[PDB]
A paper describes a structure:
For processivity, PolIIIα binds to the DNA sliding clamp (β subunit). structures of the complex in both a DNA-bound and a DNA-free state to 8 Å resolution. exonuclease simultaneously binds the polymerase and clamp. conformational changes from the DNA-free to the DNA-bound state.
into the third class in which the tail domain is not visible. number of particles, this structure was refined to 7.3 Å resolution. panel: detail of the DNA showing the ‘DNA-bound, no tail’ map. The DNA has extensive contacts with PolIIIα and clamp. entire length of the 25 base pair duplex is in contact with protein. of the polymerase contact the first 9 base pairs of the DNA duplex. held between thumb, palm and fingers domain.
Author numbering:
A (entry chain A): 1 to 927
B (entry chain C), D (entry chain B): 1 to 366
C (entry chain D): 7 to 189, 208 to 243
The structure:
DNA sequence: GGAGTCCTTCGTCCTAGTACTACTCC
DNA sequence: GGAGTAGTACTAGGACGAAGGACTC
């Protein structure tokens, strides 16, 4: 009628992962290029590209119609899995669909993926309209058997639960038994008075995409194209057929096309996106506001007694902090955040109560004195002129993101706390992905095309390391790519294929990157993904999408190294009773230690965080940083721009008096910029210096100052012109010369291009100083901890030892009997190998060994060892390495008698194990 | 080389010599046959370095001497498959040995005799002959107690103790020990020798039950056995064997006899409801009465009650049933006698009417 | 009558043209008629026209100075052409040999079209890869797989591999064949969207149109 | 619930019912038997989830009806183990089955009848009797050609074809195919049902060869087979048995006769030196002569020359010696007749005395 | 922009099932 | 000597552990 006579109601993107080929946007743009007004995307058990779908619908004037296709389990067909298409007509259906997906994953599944019981449609019912699944449906399969009674039993369920909302699916794609099914479906349709709908079961845009999709499937499944066992359920006719093509396919049943238009009108779901459903919580009978005010004033009292332990000084220095505190508090309260603050501060405190030092990341959160006051952060922001408005800007009415992270080791403990807090199902982890990037797609297509390991790896190692790498980029950057393409038929066939599959979605997404918090059940907002046992739920929307749909997130950051410090602190604080020393609080340290700076000026900063690069040690040597400010600077200094624009040499020279310091420039300086530019010797280095200069020189608000830095990033024509005027008359209003103000603005804007976030650098630099103090203040557990952290890396272990050696460290080989979990220092024995230090050995076997050593005494001999510990724990492979490492040297003086005796003794011991277990008294003496 | 021989002379030897040879040996020539013609004699030798087998067949038909080494398995299959009464003519021709019979003609690749490890000459130390039938008894009645793949390499075999005119046999796994000793009527040196499991398996195997004397020569580190023109040499195995007088129960005070078949059919039955891993039964014995109970984790249960001749106190003891079933099967007698000591020690069990053989099976902790 | 061949040359170029600046040094070809090996070998050695590559030398041995007095491809051009014309050429690593073949053909300057126009060029590696996916399907691999010995052979060089390829060829194409096993006017319902459903539809399209600036349904 | 049966009434049933079991039966109740007592009828059950086996023994001694499901292997062995004329007394005590005989007592775990899977009732369409003997010969003679595990899972089994007065069986690998047609002595409606290999194995095992007729019923998706006291039920696999009429050789023009035993002896000998996997031996036929030759990978040659009745033109054909020995083993006769086409076609073989069976082994062309 | 979290695929090792051979029973 | 059952050998399948390319802010 209006224009449209047909819309496609069966189409998947590559995000179905079991099938689909084209990405989401391209699918939508084709539909629109075809001049159709609507289009169903019915991916398999997910709505992963729904945000993209709705954004493309809006953009193109296209109405999105919501659906999915399924694998079902009904009692009528037994174990055979059949297909279902489920449409949500409204928001009742949307919620039913969200619950259905969740229910499938909660049940668990096999290699076939998650499956539903047909009778879950009893509960998951209202506002939904159904298609049979085609030839591969409940009804289709029963029809193809020709069991009319079975067919009648099956439909009867949908006549009960879905009157006028259950459809016959119609498919003419010329594939085996579609005509036999169609014959039987037409009989059924007339016999039962039923409505029918035609679709094209779309998997691709054009018939030439078929080959690529064939290979896509094969890659996922792990089978080869020409494997006879490989399912061939699909045809080249599964492309985006036009209106007219479908009109001719079904010119005998006009109502079938027309019923697509009708169904499309009935399908209207609103999911509102791009606007916050914020999380939150109460406390006492007190406001959330007032709870924060209280805990922050009183948290500030602890920090004030740490910072100024003379109470006279605390009183005189106090006003500054209270005024900063209330200024921040006013923005926080007037924007309506305090639930968020409270959750996170509780979380940080709870992890301190339990044995968890807290993960280093804060985004630019070091700009918040409130974060610091609440023990969210670790650094005094007023000491280093750190700015809250970089982190939450009051003059901007938008996203707060406070971007909180934590240490890996303790993730399950935190997941647990937040399930106790909110409800396990009201909390969710968020998907991150797999798509098929350049190296992967090469290797995967290569194996499918039957190559040996060596052939394909010879190709993939020529694809550059870089994160964003594509085949097109690879071929321009690396001359060997064009060359092997033209010289090798196997490489040509491979890259032709890889070109069609470049960037394509590969499968289920690894875990989270960070974990999300709803105010109710997470399923109130989206369906999730869960593991093989339907556990560990993760959201089907990724990080950007899930938060754009309104929910706050909590990151993993496993800069793990916290674990090192933690372990080294435990080991140091044991040395308490040995010589009555108080336990150490890394947060309580002095910032000026000379041993620390001596070692740093010597460039011996391996395992000192971010300063481990050879280049960065070269820079430290030239720079000779002698104060904490310089340590904050090292991350800002180690960048290609600043070094190779003369800025690094200026900075180094102005630091040592070999170039005079100006505020900021020789000509264009003013002494009012000195407090802002002091820490950097008159060089404009930081984003927050930009902001301080606008406040002090030209009377900007801190939030208007942050808006200028943002505008300097974008570099737009009109934009600047206005701020350039505000900046002129603001300086004029403070009596500062206009030409000086503008000439300094030009320098600010030049250096704003490189300008790094000081609050983000400082939060991380604190952790570097911690690793620096710890290293020097005791190069003695630290080393052990370094090695523990990077147990995996053989190269680094070797490096670390060479560092030990050079230091006057060093260093003993293992002992199975005496060793602790990892490296340990007896007083005299500077160092003993950890057990975990052995390369091949798993964690389980290391514990096994030590466990046996615990229950028994120290292991006396080879034999003694074998008898106590079965082969399950310590494999022969394992045992071999142990001897070769020399953990055994004490027992087996000859590295080689015991090697020969191994196998026999192992078997002997077990024969012994089984004798113990059974059964049984033995006979004679012994050997 | 050229000769012709009669299927019938060669068939039983071929079976004797092939049958222990492992499908795929570690050193290929171990799968090949040493063939030697000298005089009117073909000597066949199959070995695995542990045991050595020589067979002779007299050549009445035209011949030319020489030696070769051909694949054992395939040669034996060829000869087994030959037609009834076949007189086969074989000839060395270049690098192939040609095998003829009737109109069938075969051609096998060949390794030279010179490549084959000639194992060592030794001088005989103790010498004797005995009926084939005694030897077979001695071995059959006892072989079931050996280990499989024991670290105590001297258990993987059978201990022979020779003193005066008696030979005694023993093999054991530390849970049961099995003895038979019988008078052989020849004065021997005093010496004990442990022969390897596979050696004893094959010696038993070739003991055609019949008339032929069996004559054996032992050296210090090898043993040789003659029956007819099958001539056997093996190395011996060394270790310092444990004392059978500590394994024999000291003075078993309590005595129990019962009908062997009834006993055995009942234990076969109790065995079915024993745990597969432990093979456990519990024995309750009281004056003139005997009770078997077993169990499994599945809590399936068996009970037998039987009347036995028993004088002594009640006693409770559990065993691994496999260990006793194995002795009851080897014991091919009608009546059995048990002489018991206590729950923590050896038990004596024996043919009520013979005492040539001795069995102790160790009890279990259930 | 079918021809089994693999032609060994003065080494290979891995990069660019694998045939550029290279020429034929040895031809080792075995003749197979009615799947029986006749022994009618054309096995000849050629003019190198260049240096033998150090790698090629180590592969099966052949010295440069040995192929100097030997005749050129021009002296056996028609000889070799009639030997393979109208017959089966299945070769290992076809890109290599075909590259050389057509190269020599163009060098004759008799406008003789490429070997693939008068001879059946088939790669054996492709077929083996198809049959045994994920297994090494090189000639030596398949040789060992079908229990063919290429180690205890007096024949060294091209003739070795030709022989082996013939056995492999016959094995794959003799593995075993098949029992070819068996190979109007009516009702039904039109479901009209109700007034409620129409209103939801209208509201949904309103959103599209108001926010995005078009509605294709009303265009 | 109680019953009393004599061991000897239960023995052959129990043995037969225990055959289908070994699958590591995963659904634990499959390791057990279904006992149904109702009336004075004890019913016996063996199932492998795909088929079902029923036996009745009459109960002459005191009994009480009811049902339970006892562990199969273990109960079979207990009963097989008991002496002849043993009084077996079964009785349900709540959640356990008590077995008493004499002085022995057993208490077994019991799972309830209602957990045991039941395959459905169906209705009969074709019904017939025949001597056991005929079904025995039929299966034994041809079973060797069935696939074990193939992609064409329907060939894991056999075509049953009834038509007129003929029973006609055939089975195949996709390499060789065995065919038999027999008169069955009753007019039969046309039906086809495809029984799994395990099915045919079990059917083989239930034939004692005796004179009780076998009577089978065939439904839409099932079959039931009655011999004497036992009743067998299996369900069928979906369909599409490929067309045997297509594979038949079209006028094999050469006639070749030779003694089955001689022939089989020569194949066995020649086979020792063929390709280990595919058993390739080569055949040259000419007037009155047959030369067999084979290759083994090590260049060794086994070869037979033989006196062969043959009229026709000279041709060569080789194929897999294992398959041809299998047919010579199924050919329980002195002489063979082979009818040929060519080196690249399917083959016909018959016994010169029975056209009852038809065989095809394919060539390889080397 | 770097590194860690992420799984998945490749290689190795052990365990379980199936087949064949050899011994004991019929 | 042949058939039935046990024992041994070989094959098949699954799990574990070390490696690698990738997508997170």
């Amino acid at each position: 009628m209006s224009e449209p006579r047909f819309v496609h109601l069966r189409v998947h993107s590559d995000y179905s992962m079991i099938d689909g080929l084209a990405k989401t946007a391209p699918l939508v743009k084709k539909a629109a290029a075809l001049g159709m007004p609507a289009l169903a995307i019915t991916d398999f058990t997910n709505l992963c590209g729904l945000v993209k779908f709705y954004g493309a619908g809006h953009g193109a004037g296209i109405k999105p119609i919501v659906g999915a296709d399924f694998n079902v389990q009904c009692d009528l067909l037994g174990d055979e899995l059949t297909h279902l298409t489920v449409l949500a007509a409204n928001n009742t259906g949307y919620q039913n669909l969200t619950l259905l997906i969740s229910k499938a994953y909660q049940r668990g599944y096999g290699a076939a993926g998650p499956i539903i019981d047909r009778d879950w449609l009893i509960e998951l019912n209202e506002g939904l309209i159904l298609l049979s699944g085609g030839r591969m449906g409940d009804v289709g399969r029963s029809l193809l058997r020709g069991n009319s009674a079975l067919v009648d039993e099956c439909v009867a369920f949908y006549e009960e639960h879905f009157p006028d909302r259950y459809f016959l699916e119609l498919i003419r794609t010329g594939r085996p038994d579609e005509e036999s099914y169609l014959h039987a479906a037409v009989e059924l349709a007339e016999a039962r008075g039923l409505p029918v709908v035609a679709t094209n079961d779309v998997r691709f845009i054009d018939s030439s995409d078929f080959d690529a999709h064939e290979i896509r499937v094969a890659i996922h499944d792990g089978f080869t194209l020409d494997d006879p066992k490989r399912p061939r359920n699909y045809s080249p006719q599964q492309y985006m057929r036009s209106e007219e093509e479908m009109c001719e396919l079904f010119a005998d049943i006009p109502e079938a096309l027309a019923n697509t238009v009708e169904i499309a009108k009935r399908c209207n779901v609103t999911v509102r996106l791009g606007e916050y459903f914020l999380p939150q919580f109460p406390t006492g009978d007190m406001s959330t506001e007032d709870y924060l005010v209280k805990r922050a004033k009183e948290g500030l009292e602890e920090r004030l007694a740490f910072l100024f332990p003379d109470e006279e000084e605390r009183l005189k220095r106090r006003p500054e902090y209270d005024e900063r505190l209330e200024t921040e508090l006013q923005v926080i309260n007037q924007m309506g955040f305090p639930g968020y603050f409270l959750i996170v501060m509780e979380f940080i405190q709870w992890s301190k109560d339990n044995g968890v030092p807290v993960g280093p990341g804060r985004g630019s959160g070091a700009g918040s004195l409130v974060a610091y006051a609440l023990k969210i952060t670790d650094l005094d922001p007023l000491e280093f002129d750190l700015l809250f408005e970089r982190f939450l800007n009051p003059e901007r009415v938008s996203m707060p993101d406070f971007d909180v992270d934590f240490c890996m080791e303790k993730r399950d403990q935190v997941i647990e706390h937040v399930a106790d807090m909110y409800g396990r199902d009201a909390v969710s982890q968020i998907i991150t992905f797999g798509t098929m990037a350049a190296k992967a797609v090469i290797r995967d297509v290569g194996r499918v095309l039957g190559h040996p390991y060596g052939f394909v790896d010879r190709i993939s190692k020529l694809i550059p390391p870089d994160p964003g790498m594509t085949l097109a980029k690879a071929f321009e950057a690396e001359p060997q790519l064009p060359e092997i393409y033209e010289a090798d038929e196997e490489v040509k066939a491979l890259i032709d294929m890889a070109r069609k599959l470049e960037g394509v979605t590969r499968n289920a997404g690894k875990h989270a990157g960070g974990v999300v918090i709803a105010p109710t059940k997470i399923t109130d907002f989206a369906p999730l993904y869960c593991d093989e046992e339907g556990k560990h739920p993760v959201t089907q929307f990724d990080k950007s999408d899930v938060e754009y749909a309104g929910l706050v997130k909590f990151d993993f950051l496993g800069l793990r190294t916290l674990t090192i410090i933690n372990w080294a602190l435990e080991m140091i604080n044991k040395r308490r009773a040995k010589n009555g020393e108080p336990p150490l609080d890394i947060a309580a340290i002095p910032l000026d230690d000379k041993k620390s700076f001596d070692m740093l000026q010597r460039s011996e900063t391996t395992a000192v965080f971010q300063l481990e690069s050879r280049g960065m040690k070269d820079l430290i040597k030239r720079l000779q940083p002698d104060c904490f400010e310089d340590m904050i600077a090292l991350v800002a200094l180690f960048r290609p721009g600043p070094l190779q624009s003369g800025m690094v040499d200026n900075f180094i020279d102005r630091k040592h008096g070999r170039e005079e310091i100006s505020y900021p420039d020789v000509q264009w300086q003013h002494e009012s910029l000195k407090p802002v530019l002091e820490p950097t010797y008159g060089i404009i280095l930081y984003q927050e210096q930009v902001m301080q200069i606008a406040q002090v020189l030209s009377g900007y608000t801190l939030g208007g100052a942050d808006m200028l830095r943002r505008a300097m990033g974008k570099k737009k024509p009109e934009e600047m012109a206005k701020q350039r005027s505000v900046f002129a008359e603001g300086a004029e209003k403070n009596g500062i010369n206009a030409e000086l103000a503008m000439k300094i603005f030009d320098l600010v804007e030049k250096f704003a291009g490189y300008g790094f976030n000081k609050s983000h650098s400082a939060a991380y630099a604190l952790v570097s100083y911690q690793t620096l103090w710890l290293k020097a203040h005791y190069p003695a557990e630290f080393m052990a901890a370094v090695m523990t952290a990077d147990m995996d890396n053989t190269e680094k272990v070797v490096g670390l030892v060479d560092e030990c050696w050079r230091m006057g460290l060093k260093i003993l080989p293992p002992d199975i009997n005496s060793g602790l979990y990892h490296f340990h220092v007896n007083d005299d024995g500077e160092i003993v190998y950890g057990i975990g230090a052995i390369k091949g050995v798993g964690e389980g076997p290391i514990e096994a060994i030590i466990e046996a050593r615990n229950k028994g005494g120290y292991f006396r001999e080879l034999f003694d060892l074998c008898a106590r510990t079965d082969t399950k724990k310590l494999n022969r492979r394992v045992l071999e390495k142990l001897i070769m490492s020399g953990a055994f040297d004490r027992l087996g003086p000859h590295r080689a008698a015991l090697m020969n005796s191994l196998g026999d003794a192992l078997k002997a011991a077990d024969q012994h194990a089984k004798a113990e277990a059974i059964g049984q008294l033995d006979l004679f003496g012994v050997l | 080389m050229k000769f012709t021989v009669e299927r019938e002379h060669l068939l039983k030897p071929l079976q004797q010599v092939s049958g222990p040879l492992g499908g795929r040996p570690t050193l290929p020539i171990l799968g090949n046959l040493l063939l030697q013609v000298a005089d009117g004699t073909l000597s066949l030798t199959g070995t695995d370095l542990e045991m050595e087998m020589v067979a002779r067949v007299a050549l009445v038909q035209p011949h030319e001497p020489g030696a070769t080494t051909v694949p054992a398995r395939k040669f034996f299959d060829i000869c087994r498959g030959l037609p009834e009464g076949a007189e086969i003519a074989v000839q060395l021709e270049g690098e192939r040995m040609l095998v003829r019979s009737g109109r069938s003609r075969f051609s096998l690749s060949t390794l030279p005799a010179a490549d084959f490890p000639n194992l060592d000459d030794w001088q005989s130390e103790v010498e004797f002959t005995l009926p084939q039938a005694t030897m077979k008894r001695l071995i059959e009645a006892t072989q079931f107690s050996m280990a499989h793949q024991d670290v105590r390499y001297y258990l993987n075999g059978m201990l022979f103790e020779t003193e005066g005119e008696e030979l005694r046999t023993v093999a054991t796994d530390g849970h049961r020990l099995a003895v038979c000793s019988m008078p052989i009527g020849q004065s021997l040196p005093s010496h004990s020798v442990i022969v390897p499991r596979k050696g004893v398996i094959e010696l038993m195997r070739m003991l055609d039950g019949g008339d032929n004397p069996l004559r054996v020569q032992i050296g210090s580190n090898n043993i040789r056995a003659h029956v007819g023109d099958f001539i056997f040499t093996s190395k011996l195995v060394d270790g310092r064997f444990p004392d059978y007088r500590r394994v024999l129960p000291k003075n078993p005070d309590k005595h129990l006899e019962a009908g062997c078949d009834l006993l055995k059919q009942a234990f076969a039955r109790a065995a079915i409801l024993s745990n597969e891993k432990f093979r456990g039964v519990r024995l309750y014995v009281s004056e003139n009465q005997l009770k078997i109970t077993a169990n499994n984790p599945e809590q399936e249960e068996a009970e037998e009650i039987l009347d036995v001749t028993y004088s002594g106190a009640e006693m409770e003891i559990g065993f691994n049933v496999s260990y006793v079933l194995d002795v009851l099967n080897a014991l091919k007698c009608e009546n059995v006698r048990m002489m018991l000591t206590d729950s923590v020690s050896s038990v004596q069990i024996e043919d009520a009417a013979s005492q040539s053989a001795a069995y102790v099976v160790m009890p279990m902790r259930l | 009558r079918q021809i089994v061949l693999d032609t060994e040359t003065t080494g290979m170029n891995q990069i660019g043209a694998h045939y550029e600046g290279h020429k034929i040094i040895e031809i080792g070809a075995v003749e197979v008629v009615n799947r029986r090996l006749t022994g009618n070998n054309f096995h000849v050695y050629l003019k190198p026209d260049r240096l033998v590559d150090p790698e090629a030398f180590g592969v099966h041995g052949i010295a440069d100075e040995f192929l100097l007095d030997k005749p050129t491809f021009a002296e056996v051009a028609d000889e070799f052409m009639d030997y393979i014309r109208g017959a089966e050429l299945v070769i290992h690593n076809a890109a290599f040999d075909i590259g050389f073949m057509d190269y020599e053909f163009s060098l004759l300057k008799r406008d003789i079209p490429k070997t693939n126009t008068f001879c059946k060029v088939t790669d054996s590696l492709a077929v083996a890869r198809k049959m045994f996916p994920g297994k090494r399907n090189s000639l030596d691999a398949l040789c060992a797989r079908y229990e063919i010995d290429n180690s205890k052979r007096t024949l060294h060089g091209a003739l070795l591999d030709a022989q082996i390829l013939a056995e492999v060829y016959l094995a794959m194409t003799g593995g075993q064949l098949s029992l070819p096993l068996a190979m109007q006017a009516s009702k039904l319902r039109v479901v009209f969207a109700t007034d409620e459903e129409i209103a939801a539809h209208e509201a949904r399209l309103d959103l599209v149109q108001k926010k995005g600036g078009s509605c294709l349904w009303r265009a």
